[PDB]
């Protein structure tokens, strides 16, 4: 006689044998909660004669449920600078550390964001400063009504430098929420890039952000690193330019630590390819973002 099958968070299990009898020969089946989670690919265990539940492949250890990244229940389709509707950008995070910021949800309990966001901007005075993070809506007062999410710890890329006044490398950070969130149709994860070909000229992505009450967005193309010249050019190996002389002041729709979201057509997902950085004014219609892919192996090792 075995015991009470171990629990499987974000998932459960059913008995395929008389139910409630964990005696020798019993047999159960695990299943992650649909549709927001999915087993790590059928999760069948059976009380061996010895006295433990097993699975002829990884036996003795319970499967793992994960969430589905970049795949909202409300996507959207030239170029523009319009308003956002509940669902379009589900992985969107609005912060309020040292001023208004942004960030993208990763997985179940981590938020991606640019590092310079966590520190006051120079020429600004030092101060107490709670870290406020919100998600699950497009309006500001609403995101507030919902309340903020307590942060457990804060990991900032080791390359970033505070005394350096121009960080064209390592302007990325990860915040670990203290309690996972409640994945709804309005609040869901975004995927990470893996193909170097995600940073190709002309590629069309979307940027979203507040200004300032209702979250807006823009559909801009990846530009040539030359376009972003006044901001300084080895700024190519750690970042990328993007925008168009047409957009005007809307090329800077993003907030800061917000995200540059592209949608892979071969798999119709959604991947965060960049992080709006420390720039300040899209006068010509251009702006630079940090290359996320250069930091993927980092992101993952932090999330374990
Ligand atoms: C700033 O520190 C905390 C921030 O939450 C606040 O409670 C406090 O009143 C401020 N500093 C003081 C002691 O005035």
Swiss-Prot record:
The active site is at residues 116, 171, 256. Residues 78-304 form the Peptidase S1 domain. Disulfide bonds join 2-47, 32-65, 69-191, 228-241, 252-282. Changing residue 53 to R: In EDSPD1; uncertain significance. Glycans are attached at residues 128, 195. It comes from the Eukaryota. It is found in: Secreted; Cell surface. Residues 1-67 form the Sushi domain. Cleaved and activated by autocatalytic processing to generate Complement C1r subcomponent heavy and light chains that are connected by disulfide bonds. The iron and 2-oxoglutarate dependent 3-hydroxylation of aspartate and asparagine is (R) stereospecific within EGF domains. Serine protease component of the complement C1 complex, a multiprotein complex that initiates the classical pathway of the complement system, a cascade of proteins that leads to phagocytosis and breakdown of pathogens and signaling that strengthens the adaptive immune system. C1R catalyzes the first enzymatic step in the classical complement pathway: it is activated by the C1Q subcomplex of the C1 complex, which associates with IgG or IgM immunoglobulins complexed with antigens to form antigen-antibody complexes on the surface of pathogens. It is linked to Ehlers-Danlos syndrome, periodontal type, 1: A form of Ehlers-Danlos syndrome, a connective tissue disorder characterized by hyperextensible skin, atrophic cutaneous scars due to tissue fragility and joint hyperlaxity. EDSPD1 is characterized by the association of typical features of Ehlers-Danlos syndrome with gingival recession and severe early-onset periodontal disease, leading to premature loss of permanent teeth. EDSPD1 inheritance is autosomal dominant. The CUB domain 2 shows a compact folded structure in the presence of Ca(2+), whereas it has a flexible, disordered conformation in the absence of Ca(2+). Ca(2+) could provide a switch between the folded and disordered forms; low Ca(2+) could provide flexibility to promote autoprocessing and activation of CIR. Belongs to the peptidase S1 family. Core component of the complement C1 complex, a calcium-dependent complex composed of 1 molecule of the C1Q subcomplex, 2 molecules of C1R and 2 molecules of C1S. The C1Q subcomplex is composed 18 subunits: 3 chains of C1QA, C1QB, and C1QC trimerize to form 6 collagen-like triple helices connected to six globular ligand-recognition modules. Within the C1 complex, C1R is a dimer of identical chains, each of which is activated by cleavage into two chains, heavy and light, connected by disulfide bonds. This is Complement C1r subcomponent. It comes from Homo sapiens (Human). The lineage of its organism: Eukaryota, Metazoa, Chordata, Craniata, Vertebrata. The gene is C1R. The chain holds residues 375 to 702 of 705 of the full protein.
